[PDB]
Amino acid sequence: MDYLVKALAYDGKVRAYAARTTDMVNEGQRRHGTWPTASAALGRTMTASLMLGAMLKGDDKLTVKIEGGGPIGAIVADANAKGEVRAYVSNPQVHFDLNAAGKLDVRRAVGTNGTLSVVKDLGLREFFTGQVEIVSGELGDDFTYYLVSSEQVPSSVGVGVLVNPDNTILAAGGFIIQLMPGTDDETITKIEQRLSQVEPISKLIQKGLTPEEILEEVLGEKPEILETMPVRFHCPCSKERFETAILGLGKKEIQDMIEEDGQAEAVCHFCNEKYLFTKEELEGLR
Amino acid sequence: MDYLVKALAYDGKVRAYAARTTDMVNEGQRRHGTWPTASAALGRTMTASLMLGAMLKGDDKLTVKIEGGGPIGAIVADANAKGEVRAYVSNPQVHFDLNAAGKLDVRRAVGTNGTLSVVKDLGLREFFTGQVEIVSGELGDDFTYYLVSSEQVPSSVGVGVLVNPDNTILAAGGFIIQLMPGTDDETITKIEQRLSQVEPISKLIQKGLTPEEILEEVLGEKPEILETMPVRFHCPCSKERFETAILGLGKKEIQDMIEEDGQAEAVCHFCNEKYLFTKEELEGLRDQTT
Amino acid sequence: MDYLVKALAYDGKVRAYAARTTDMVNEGQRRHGTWPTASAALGRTMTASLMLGAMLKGDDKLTVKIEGGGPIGAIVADANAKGEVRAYVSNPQVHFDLNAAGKLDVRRAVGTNGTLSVVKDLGLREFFTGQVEIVSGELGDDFTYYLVSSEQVPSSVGVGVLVNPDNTILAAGGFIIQLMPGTDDETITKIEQRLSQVEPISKLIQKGLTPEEILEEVLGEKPEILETMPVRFHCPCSKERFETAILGLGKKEIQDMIEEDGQAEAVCHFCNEKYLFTKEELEGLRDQTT
Amino acid sequence: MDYLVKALAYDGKVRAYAARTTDMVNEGQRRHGTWPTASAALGRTMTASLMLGAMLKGDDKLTVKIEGGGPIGAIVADANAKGEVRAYVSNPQVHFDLNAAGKLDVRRAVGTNGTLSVVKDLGLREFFTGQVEIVSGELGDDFTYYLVSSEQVPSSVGVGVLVNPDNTILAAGGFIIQLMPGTDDETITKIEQRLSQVEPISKLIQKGLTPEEILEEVLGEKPEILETMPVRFHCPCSKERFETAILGLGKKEIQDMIEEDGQAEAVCHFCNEKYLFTKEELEGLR
Ligand SMILES: [Zn+2]
Ligand SMILES: [Zn+2]
Ligand SMILES: [Zn+2]
Ligand SMILES: [Zn+2]
């Protein structure tokens, strides 16, 4: 039921993407136990990251790191060309009152003193990196700035997350609209005004609009859908793997951890799975 | 008379660039005293860099570095948004027998085990880097691979340099063509055919085709010109830069210079400009420095 | 009271370095507002860099860059031959649950897919670079691997940082031991035993062991001291540097600053020093710039 | 009969290397057809490079590139931990009169406006590089400067090549002496003076001294020999390999080269083996 669409509009002058990510954002919330404001920052990042990741091909993948000096600390999302995302926030426990407009105060959680970086991993010696300063802190506008100023593509990013009173996620989705080099300086203005006039993405997702519908409303025309794909929260961590974490400590600290408890545990930061090594298992190296 | 153009074609679905860089590549050859194979590697790199630079705006700028492990060492080119390039290679006097096609063996000079990287300065606190493997060593195809990797639109970079027996440059130029979204398949196979179907770019320049004409030839239609700009080899070094560096050595090292040599020649590695500090200049610096 | 020593031991067959860097790592923590795990990565890197720097002479200097792919991003440290370090991490507010040994999970912050590189400026036209894979992520072992790769003598780098619950630094220090040619096997197994047999370096510092005492403890004999030096966190940035950068933006961008903000804050990314340009200062710059 | 020794002296305070490279330098001369002055530059580079290469371990390897602006152009040598060297000069045809001292005028051939670089390849993302300016042009003293100033190890390099009237090589060999960190400022002076007083390496190789003997004369004591190994000119190029060169041109220039000659050739720059592709062979791609 979560998915992403790749689209064109205006006869190939607009390259567009849209997604519905309610289930994956709910899974992020549950795994990390984020408080509402942190959920909003997490889901906004996850959704934007997924759509960046969909711009990739094949086995290529990317990582977004945001750390604006606010109490949530660093937010990291991995996304790939298959629409698999894993993401965490460094401090899930962030509470503030609503802002003046009655929305979760994401910019106070994130902070605006630091950077948004995107690292694309194409192979062992092949990568593309980009970095800008966080100028908004609401995340959607920071991703816009990344696209416009580091990637130098005229773009508009909208991401929205609605949090239920019980702290679960009601809805999440977003879009990215990009104007291609060919676009005549006049059709640019038709789209820029219609974007500036349509309802914010949070309102659109509140009404239950699908990704195609969101693109149509925001664009003022039905888009050519190039591809739809399913998307999911996914983290490939496993116990064998955390072994290497534990191996990396050695035979000393390993002989300890035990002789003192008869066990040890390690935690995946992306998905919060916990791995317990029993006494027998720990002995299998020491 | 060297210059570059920015262009669209096929109702804005093709974005294109082209340049004639004979004079600037000749300046590089002259400054660094490259041998033919190395001039070809240097001038291909310069021309490709200039065109990437043309995709920037304002005061932005970029640096290309090729390090394939070959005898030429590193090839480094700075390019800004205003049509100015400076470039050097580690080892300018690099040359070989002609390759099996009777052309300059650029791949042998460059090496095929290493990377091509592009680092962009896009303003205070806006940063972009890319790095790809060298896949060819002939450079045109490497830049194509960098562009396709970077922007994931079909791209084609052509660059050429013809060198005279006296080691001077006879011609240099290039183009970049990129097919944006919504390019229909008729235009693709038009363009791809033309591409893998038309003459070498350095002979088009030698024939005296303009940048505009080259795009017409390659594209199959007259391009829409968005901008033309003069271009040149330029390094902003000056004697003052080197004076400052000599000062930073301290009195002792300077006095060594005066005593064993009576003078000092400082050389910019980017453009090989040579600056001479007389005994008296150096005495002034020894006495100025703390 | 932070300082570093240079030493020999076992009749000159062992070359050694040690430092107490509590205060400088505390300055880095404070400047950048690192969270515990990131302070440990930052301070380990700083201390290792300082000691590498101590192997240099004169005005020479070096830059360490760690890029393992982890959440902290890049860790960059400049170190000179005069005991001065500046360093930053991309993302200071990085932290996790304790690792399986109940210690700060530095490897998780750093990542284990990337490189550690060292670029040395050894004078006008003398250059040295090294780069190795990250093998651990815990940093001590990575620096050891860099040194063994570089000089091919048995080496050991220890570095530690203890952080308080309030995020301040309680202790930081380190050592490097290298076994030169002709070290007999009795001294090797002496040293290797001691090494893989003695307490953590950050607790030795907390206990209030000096650098000298730490080398004694690790080596099994009192070292011969060759040099002691004061050390510190220092970044030579100043408001003037940023003024110059603002000037370089042009009148228009500056006027935007004045109009939308009434002022401008410029921040050094190396040391996070914050410089404030009042409306009037900015008016001065807008009018000065061409 | 060519070989290299690894040594210590002065109870581990001196780390030393020496080699006899007459046969490999003769092979370089024959392959490239160097004229005498070029032979001297080539052999000096080969011998120094071999001894640098012996400092390496395992499968690690290095490349020395020298290009001083003189008529010989770029000199490149590869050397590995096994003492395999391959090396060429860009212009083998360099003639000058003898210098004032009656020796081949290597510095006029090489030139002193450019750099000596050494790249050590430890793996795909692992390398050490060093570069200095060429300050002598005679090569031995440039290698000394590389070791002293880039690698920061107090060192003395001696390399010598004697060329026969018939242009073949009569002798070639060299040494490197390094002073270790422990060396007391007084035993440094005993060695520095004895080095400054002994006969130049060309004279020593003229008299037929082996590597061990050269170390003993230059050191003033018999060295501890740690290892001896055989050394050779070796280049692993093959026809299959040059295929990739030719493949890298494509199917067009390939269809040509032929339809016009019925063949094509490519040449290894390091060893000057020539590879001929027949009409049938060229067709096996086009
Ligand atoms: Zn996980
Ligand atoms: Zn210059
Ligand atoms: Zn600073
Ligand atoms: Zn060969």
UniProtKB/Swiss-Prot annotation, chains B, C:
GO molecular function per UniProt: protein folding chaperone; unfolded protein binding
Superkingdom per UniProt: Bacteria
GO biological process, one term: protein refolding
Family from the record: Belongs to the HSP33 family.
GO CC annotations on file: cytoplasm
Keywords for the protein's UniProt record, in alphabetical order: Chaperone, Cytoplasm, Disulfide bond, Redox-active center, Zinc
Source lineage: Bacteria, Bacillati, Bacillota, Bacilli, Bacillales
Main localisation: cytoplasm
Database matches in InterPro entries: Heat_shock_Hsp33, Heat_shock_Hsp33_C, Heat_shock_Hsp33_N
Function: Redox regulated molecular chaperone. Protects both thermally unfolding and oxidatively damaged proteins from irreversible aggregation. Plays an important role in the bacterial defense system toward oxidative stress.
Disulfide bonding pattern of the chain: C235-C237, C268-C271
Protein encoded by which gene: hslO
Subcellular location: Cytoplasm
Mod. after translation: Under oxidizing conditions two disulfide bonds are formed involving the reactive cysteines. Under reducing conditions zinc is bound to the reactive cysteines and the protein is inactive.
Pfam families membership: HSP33 (PF01430)
The protein's name in its UniProt record: 33 kDa chaperonin
Keyword Chaperone in record: yes
Entry keyword annotation includes Chaperone: yes
